[PDB]
Design a protein around this ligand. Structure first.
Ligand SMILES: Nc1ncnc2c1ncn2[C@@H]1O[C@H](COP(=O)(O)OP(=O)(O)O)[C@@H](O)[C@H]1O
Lengths: 192, 272, 342, 192, 192, 131
């Protein structure tokens, strides 16, 4: 069950769910498998906040063991498209898609908790059918890997060669190690 | 008088008896003259009840005002101070009987048309069992108001005893282009005539055209601002004209065209 | 009698911008006085009153325009807040008290009160959703069109053992001004074609607030109806004016262009003692930039300048042989004190 | 859960769903497999906006791996019928049906994100029964392929033969390629 | 179902669910298996309370047979990050993950019921695939075991060696035994 | 005091004051509540000081009255908690010296009285000089 919270405003008292209350403060939750339905929901929330005030930064909490790539690119392109900066915070775990969106935040506004873990791996896909069709699908996933690796190097700041080799196999990066890699700028440990 | 100001006795709001006091001022505090006077009340719909049938709390501004007016309209002695209680001993509060004082109530009712439409609307039930098709046709607001009955007013939030004091009921209709056009020139204190006099005193003549009035009427009914909206359009069209009219001179006549109202032209000036 | 151009030039001396709005006020006042002065009404036609409506954001100098017009004339002027007013039977605030304030300005002169120019401020915040709400506005209906109002004899609390004077409001011009928040959004949906919250939809990130003022110029009665105002009030106000907001460039003008300018006041004070005062253009622009950054408004500008000059004016009388004072950007920030000439 | 948002108006505060709030601004979301149930929902949203303002354009976001062809025809015919111009934006991916509706938007108002993917392929269908019955069903799928290609050629502007050759087998077009092929007009890389 | 309660306020009475009414009093319930969805819900409540009153204490009730570690680390870091002290109370059971959160409570604000069970065991996990892939995944869980034990020793106060020895196998510690171990600070038996 | 420094006429208007009156006063000045050191000076620096008033009463009886700087510091601290201003100082002294004046004239062979900081808190009793 989702709890309900009461917000006191000059106009009066209003009751909103916990997730809706944080949305007012420019906070979005990315949890679970990455699919088209959850991704389209995040996109709507991003565009909704941009219209209200496209000057304040947006905070995105990421905790997910990856998912589909098409749904993730809709979020990545949206974060870069909108004028305000999107601050990504990693809590729990961050797989390939969770890490691709985490590192895709505005430079200087990327954080990770001390015990949170990160993980980067290459695209996983498969197709069964005619030999000719297999070639089309095989080249398609390879192009996606190149696009992801190129963008990963751009955001991380690491050389493209380093990104390709490190992402060839699953690489579990701790919060301190992630900062060295450049996925996140700093580690949030205590308030002030 | 203003019904909104009236409130139940024993409250900060204006008392009902003050209405009779105003009448005395007109006849120089003459009780006899006031007894045969005429009284008009405006916006009487404001005091109607707003879903107050349960009577959770007494409404001094609404139902309370109606109750006080029940006996006043019928006729009764009213204790009003002659000169605001000049002296406590021998006050001699004026006793003005309202048995022969006529009262006229007026107010715009919003939603009453729907109430009448629902009553006039046919249809006993829904489904195959229904023996009546419930056929209905669109009707104008004025047409529906003509079919008004006391039962409809009760549902609006009026006490049956109150409406019973008003036996004769009169309704009004909306306005059309022809009506607005005539109102602009036919009445003595017409809008167009007022501007003509304002220009005549400055040695300047003003003329209008039928095409201009048509656009004025269409714009007025298009904005849904009633007859008052006319003034807004007229002044807006002649704003720039009168803003600099006193500066120059040697102008004898002014002519307004339809294009001027549309905003793509300007008034024509005639030099003597 | 003065022509509209005369009032225009007069206001321009104490106001910068609002050209369209200035024309409306001048024309209305000129026409109203002609009607008032021509009380004989030689012609059979009877003249009718006119009302003014002002729509502009906060800090748009709406009160300044009303005060300037009142100062230019000998008729009494009054300012009031619509939010304070309440319906009958409530805590006690009534529309009748408004006329009482006007009478106090003219020393309880009924004849003078009729020629007075009444003004309303903060008309917003009161509208249809018991609570008073729109009921407060309803009491104003009879006042705008014209009606007799009972007022105490000498501005005292209502007592039953006394009589109340009657003042006819059929000749009192009413100027209703208020700041509307959200009206521009309603107008945009009506006149502008945009998809609002959309990927390709336009957003207000360009920072060109000037467009908002232009949009308000296209206000229509239907837009006010959407805001919640009852059609009676919109019809009672035939004249409507729009005032745009201040900009960094315009704010710089207010610092020196007005006759009673902020910089001119300090310059007169400084040269009165014999020490010249010079306001660098960079410092003036920074002052306006600071107010806009903190959105303090035109009022906050005074406090910003007072901070730098407060320390300077304290030590200036101590020494002698001072010829000129030069203010710079560092003086505004407070890093260094203003230099003096010896 | 779908988060709630509050729209502040002169009348007063009101609450709407994130999807419902965007609908008020003429924004429709096309997500997941295309079926008769979701298509009727989109058709209703379109007709509702046409009555409110037949002069304001409509924006349609598409993120889906295709679906039923029948359901797409109800949407395609509904966009071409209504007077307003329907803008299409591809977020994440756009399969055969997602691409057909994407390119079916108003000319000059078709967009694609930088990392979005597109895919076009011929109709896939099968029937089991008598040889005579199979003949009837076989004819329809061939006819559907021809009609679909002609419509794509009209909106895209490419020759009919070219569309048929490209749609014969699975073809993947990136955001630049989509613009070159005429599926979309421009790429909304950034806010301005 | 969930019952509703009434809160008597000076203005008027309000209706809230049994879980929302306790949230106003800075009380959070941790029930059932630990996962990303339930963990993100607790994190939002913790942050929502920090803004309302960052000086008052927060009470966290734990009753669960453990769960995911990544979902739990997001809660642990959130407790240590925020300024308020998080009080932990064990009701009935506290598994490995529950025990870690229970010991993580602020010093002097840890309690357990008399008939309460606690359990501490090393992280459990498995991976299948290539031999090389198995090794990298094995390193992550081994690191997690060390990190968990190190943090466990810190809050508990026991030596790291002792914690490693005891947590090697399942260890069921009763309420009195838990006090001796140092997982808690006191026991609540009756209201004073 | 920091909030008072960042005060503008708009804030006063929000409170419910007419703007015309606020405009007549374009100059504004801010102050701050007395501090621990300030209270110490106010306690003895004025001619009609609180300490001098009680000293005169004790002198009238024939016994000397003495005060300690350490005890005075505690009095200032308590006044700040009450935030009642300078007037509150009188109440603090009356409460601490209530028991003293009740039995002060009863005692004999007393020449001077000494007050300690603990006496103000209530744990200790006022010291009396006998001789
Ligand atoms: N156009 C303008 N010309 C001159 N002064 C202005 C102008 N607009 C604002 N001001 C200044 O702003 C100050 C406060 O204006 P204010 O009464 O708050 O405007 P509004 O009534 O629109 O909120 C005034 O003292 C005035 O000098």
């Amino acid at each position: 069950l989702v709890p309900m919270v009461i917000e006191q405003t000059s106009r009066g008292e209003r009751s909103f769910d916990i997730y809706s209350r944080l949305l007012k403060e420019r906070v979005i939750f990315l949890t679970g498998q990455v699919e088209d339905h959850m991704a389209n929901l995040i996109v709507a929330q991003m565009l909704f906040l941009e219209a209200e005030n496209p000057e304040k930064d947006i905070y995105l909490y990421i905790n997910s063991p990856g998912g589909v790539i098409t749904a993730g690119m809709s979020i990545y392109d949206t974060m870069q498209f909108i004028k305000p900066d999107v601050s990504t915070i990693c809590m729990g775990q961050a797989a390939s898609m969770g890490a691709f969106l985490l590192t895709a935040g505005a430079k200087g506004k990327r954080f990770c908790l001390p015990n949170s873990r990160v993980m980067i791996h290459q695209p996983l896909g498969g197709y069964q059918g005619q030999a000719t069709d297999i070639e089309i699908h095989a080249r398609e996933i390879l192009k996606v890997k190149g696009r992801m690796n190129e963008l990963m190097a751009l955001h991380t700041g690491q050389s493209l060669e380093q990104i390709e080799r490190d992402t060839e196999r699953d690489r579990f990066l701790s919060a301190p190690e992630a900062v060295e890699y450049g996925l996140v700028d700093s580690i949030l440990t205590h308030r002030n | 008088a203003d019904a909104t100001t009236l409130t139940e006795a024993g409250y900060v709001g204006e008392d009902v008896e003050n209405i009779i006091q105003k009448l005395l001022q007109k006849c120089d505090y003459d009780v006899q003259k006031a007894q045969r006077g005429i009284v008009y009340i405006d916006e009487i719909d404001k005091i109607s009840r707003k879903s107050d049938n349960p009577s959770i709390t007494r409404d001094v501004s609404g139902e309370g005002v109606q109750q006080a007016l029940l006996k006043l309209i019928e006729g009764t002695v009213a204790a009003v101070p002659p000169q605001g209680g000049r002296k406590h001993p021998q006050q001699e509060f004026l006793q003005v009987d309202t048995s022969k004082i006529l009262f006229i109530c007026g107010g715009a009712f919003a939603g009453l048309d729907k109430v009448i439409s629902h009553r006039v609307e046919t249809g006993s039930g829904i489904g195959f069992g229904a023996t009546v098709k419930a056929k209905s046709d669109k009707a104008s607001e004025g047409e529906l108001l003509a079919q008004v009955e006391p039962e409809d007013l009760i549902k609006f939030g009026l006490i049956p005893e109150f409406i019973g004091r008003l036996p004769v009921v009169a309704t009004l209709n909306e306005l059309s282009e022809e009506a607005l056009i005539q109102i602009l020139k036919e009445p003595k204190n017409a809008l167009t005539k007022q501007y003509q006099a304002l220009f005549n005193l400055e040695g300047v003549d003003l003329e209008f055209r039928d095409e201009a009035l048509d656009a004025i009427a269409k714009k007025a009914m298009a904005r849904k601002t009633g007859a008052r909206g006319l003034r807004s359009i007229v002044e807006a069209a002649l704003l720039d004209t009168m803003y600099d009219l006193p500066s120059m001179e040697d102008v004898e006549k002014v002519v307004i065209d339809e294009s001027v109202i549309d905003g793509q032209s300007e008034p024509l000036l005639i030099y003597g | 009698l003065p022509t509209p151009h005369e009032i225009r030039n007069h206001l321009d001396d104490y106001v910068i911008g609002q050209e369209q709005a200035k024309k409306v006020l001048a024309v209305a006042v000129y026409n109203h006085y002609k009607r008032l002065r021509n009380g004989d009404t030689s012609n059979g036609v009877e003249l009718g009153k006119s009302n003014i409506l002002l729509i502009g954001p906060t800090g748009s100098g709406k009160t300044l325009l009303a005060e300037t017009l009142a100062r230019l004339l000998d008729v009494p002027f009054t300012m009031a807040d619509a939010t304070t007013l309440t319906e009958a039977g409530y805590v006690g605030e009534d529309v009748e008290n408004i006329i009482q304030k006007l009478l106090q300005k003219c020393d309880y002169d009924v004849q003078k009160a009729q020629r007075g120019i009444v003004y309303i401020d903060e008309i917003d915040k009161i509208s249809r959703k018991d609570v008073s709400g729109e009921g407060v506005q309803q009491a104003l209906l009879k006042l705008i069109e014209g009606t007799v109002a009972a007022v105490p004899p000498q501005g005292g609390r209502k007592h039953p053992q006394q009589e109340f004077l009657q003042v006819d409001t059929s000749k009192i011009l009413f100027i209703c001004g208020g700041a509307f928040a959200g009206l521009d959004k309603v107008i945009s949906h009506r006149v502008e074609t945009g998809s609002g919250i959309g990927f390709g939809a336009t957003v207000k990130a360009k920072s060109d607030k000037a467009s908002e003022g232009e949009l308000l110029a296209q206000v229509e009665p239907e837009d006010l109806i959407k805001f919640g105002l009852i059609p009676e009030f919109i019809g009672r106000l035939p004249v409507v004016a729009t005032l745009n907001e201040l900009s960094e460039e315009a704010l710089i003008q207010i610092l020196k262009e007005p006759k009673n300018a902020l910089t001119k006041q300090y310059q007169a004070l400084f040269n009165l003692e014999g020490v010249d005062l010079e306001f660098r253009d960079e410092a003036l622009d920074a002052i306006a930039k600071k107010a806009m950054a903190r959105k303090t408004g035109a009022r906050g500008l005074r406090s910003i300048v007072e901070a730098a000059l407060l320390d300077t004016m304290y030590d200036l009388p101590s020494m002698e042989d001072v010829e000129k004072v030069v203010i710079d950007e560092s003086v505004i920030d407070g890093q260094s004190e203003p230099l003096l000439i010896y």
